Amino acid sequence: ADEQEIKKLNVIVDKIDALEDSMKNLSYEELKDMTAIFKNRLKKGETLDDILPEAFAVVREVSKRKLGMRQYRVQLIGGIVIHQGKIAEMKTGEGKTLVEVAPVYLNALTGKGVHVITVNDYLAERDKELMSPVYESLGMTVGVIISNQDPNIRKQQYKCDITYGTNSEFGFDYLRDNMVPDLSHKVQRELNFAIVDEVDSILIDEARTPLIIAGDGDEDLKLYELANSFVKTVKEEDFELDRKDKTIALTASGISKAESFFGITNLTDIKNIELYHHINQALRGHKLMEKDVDYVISNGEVMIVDEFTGRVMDGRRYTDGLHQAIEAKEGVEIKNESKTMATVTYQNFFRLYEKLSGMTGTAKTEEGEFESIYKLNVVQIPTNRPVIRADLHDKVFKTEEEKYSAVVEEIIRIHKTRQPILVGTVSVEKSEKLSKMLKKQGIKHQVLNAKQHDKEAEIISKAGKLDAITIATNMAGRGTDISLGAGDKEEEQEVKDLGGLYVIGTERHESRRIDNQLRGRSGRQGDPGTSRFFVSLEDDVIKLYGGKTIEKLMKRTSSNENTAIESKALTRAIERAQKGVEGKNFEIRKNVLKYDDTINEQRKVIYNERNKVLNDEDIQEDIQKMVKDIIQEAGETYLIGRKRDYYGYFKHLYSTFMPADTLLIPGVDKKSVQEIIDSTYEISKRVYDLKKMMLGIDKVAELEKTVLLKVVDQYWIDHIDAMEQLKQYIGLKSYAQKDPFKEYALEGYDMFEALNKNIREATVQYLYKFN
Ligand SMILES: Nc1ncnc2c1ncn2[C@@H]1O[C@H](COP(=O)(O)OP(=O)(O)OP(O)(O)=S)[C@@H](O)[C@H]1O
């Protein structure tokens, strides 16, 4: 079992050990000073790895002094392992919180910024508060990212050398960090290196659901209303149209009416894009479309119509604000709720780190997933002292009452013997149910229902001592330790001889992993302990995932009340049920990660092409590129497409971005598509020269960024929410052999081209059409 991987690793610790004595003589400052010595050496030569022995050795004595926690080889091996970029499988109570110190320090010497992710706020704040004396003492700084944290403070934390926090906030922050307008609000920093505590939990387990930021539609609510009232008051002269090419615009009569109606007196400018966009689809919905032709009004809602059948294309909603507009138009309750803006799985958010790593107590079994996703290599480490415990069997039953009384009675029994027990549950109500019998009978205990992880954290530590009964859910008091004695050497041996801590799990969990975690809370290093599972036939995991066996047994009749069950075949069935929800879950992540890849490739560019604008990167060759793009398109459409519809081609460009009287070109019949476009484009290069010369190349470029970036946001968020609705729409399909994913990709590919186009034709319009 990973013998040589650990053996070679052992050579590293072997060296760390020889060094120890030399540093022993050193003062507190002779040690801090070393952080610098380190940094400077890194510039002169040596790799982070070439430093490893001394680096960790320095964390050893500094740790060995400010917290007492000197480090044990296993805690060193694991330290090296995190730095090597893998998983550090150590069992509960093995000291993982400290296995991290040595590795952060080492990597934090680059000034880049290390990341330590935990399962929750408390776990992170506590983790940082504990090891900070080691970090601080060595000339480094630490910060932790907690929930509802103001931007000002939040910035400072990533600024610090080391940073801790809930997995939810790191990936969350990021979203806002890339979703934000200017940089006065970006909060993150370079995602360089991360250490994931309880890696199986965040990565493998959470994976199932993605992170999603949404937005409260207060603004939009009365916005379509105002726009719709105005478009309503508007006259035929206030706008011009063309149902032939499905376009419409607001004439000069409208610009002023809008400025007079609203308090906005400028319009057309990037500042206002909003009122303008809204009044736009408000107008289009009012005249370009019509009742019973385009869209239809059934009951209290407005459904869309398909042109290929005349049927109602249900499920699908109108694009970029349109439906919301038609709704306002007719006079029906508007769907203004849950706006999905940001979204991301941990499968990818974590892929975004130069060097990934983590620790846990159960991962080598899921290695194939950890590697073929995060290319995380699980390396198992030996436990410090030999692990002696009693991982007892699964007391099998039928009927929850039978299972429950068996549990209640076995607890009164262990309790009198004087030993503590840990009753693991998997529901706040089940924990209360099991609680009722104990109270009904008269035996003291406390309920840890994962809500105030800190208050409960204290409770579980004490739980580990003398006559205590603690019923915790599978998420209550996690990183806390079960010290036999609760801090006393007296109760330590008393409870040590009595046979450790006892663990009883209500039902078999969703995986062997979660179960061994209840089993793991006991028997650390060198402590006796027992753990047993009181299972029953109606427990869902078996009830639904068991098979034909549990069914007939459950159906039969009734006989031996309170009498437990057994059989070879019975167990053979109980295990398939768990490995069945194991595989069920294996594939739910598969069909969540892929659906994200599609949006991840998109979100990838929309983001780079968003960051260009922010870090003052030149966008002139690119805007000009898309400007040419619009025209090359006009080419295939009217130029070549229909045949040579000059009136249309020109209407399209006047429609799109060209001014009023400009594209006048001789030749036409004598000239070819390309030449005609080269001309239309030179005519455009001139239009921009008029702009630069009359505005100043600087405002011209400065303005280039103001509107490119602004329209991306408007059309991107809407493309995202809509890409989600697209997924929901595939649900009502299947066909002969049409993969539900395949369709989603195609209808998502062109949907991306439509989005990008809505940007091409929009940056330019604002950049040329009016000024
Ligand atoms: N080398 C050590 N010497 C003394 N105490 C130690 C040492 N290492 C860890 N501890 C103690 O062990 C307890 C912490 O164990 P943890 O770090 O929680 O182990 P773990 O359960 O693997 O970690 P989590 O829950 O993934 S942080 C604390 O009471 C520490 O004081």
Numbering used by the authors: 1 to 771
Mind quoting what the paper says about this structure?
SecA is a cytosolic ATPase composed of multiple domains that undergo a series of conformational changes associated with the domain movement during the cycles of ATP binding and hydrolysis in the sequential translocation of the target protein through the SecY channel. We therefore determined two crystal structures of the CDSecA2 protein (apo and in complex with adenosine-5′-(γ-thio)-triphosphate (ATP-γ-S)). Crystal structures show that CDSecA2 has a fold similar to its homologues, with multidomain organization consisting of NBD1, NBD2, PPXD, HSD and HWD, but lacks CTT.
The crystal of the CDSecA2 and ATP-γ-S complex diffracted considerably worse than the apo structure with a notable anisotropic component. Correspondingly, its structure was less well resolved. Nevertheless, the electron density map for the ATP-γ-S ligand unambiguously positioned it in the active site. The structures of apo CDSecA2 and CDSecA2-ATP-γ-S complex were very similar as they aligned with RMSD 0.85 Å. Binding of ATP-γ-S did not lead to any considerable conformational change such as opening of the PPXD. Crystal packing of CDSecA2 requires contacts between PPXD of one and NBD1 and NBD2 of the adjacent SecA2 molecule, therefore larger conformational changes of PPXD would disrupt the crystal lattice. As evident from the CDSecA2-ATP-γ-S complex structure, the highly conserved residues involved in ATP binding and hydrolysis were positioned within Walker motifs A and B at the interface of NBD1 and NBD2, and are present in all SecA homologues, including CDSecA1 and CDSecA2. As in another SecA the opposite side of the gamma phosphate moiety of ATP-γ-S contains the conserved lysine (K106) in Walker motif A in both SecA1 and SecA2 in C. difficile, and the mutation of this lysine is lethal, suggesting its essential role of both systems. From the CDSecA2 structure with the bound nucleotide and residue conservation in structural alignments, we thought that the requirements for ATP binding and hydrolysis were likely similar to those of other SecA ATPases. With respect to the PPXD position and the extent of interactions between one SecA2 molecule and crystallographic symmetry-related molecules, apo and ATP-γ-S-bound CDSecA2 crystallized as a closed monomer.
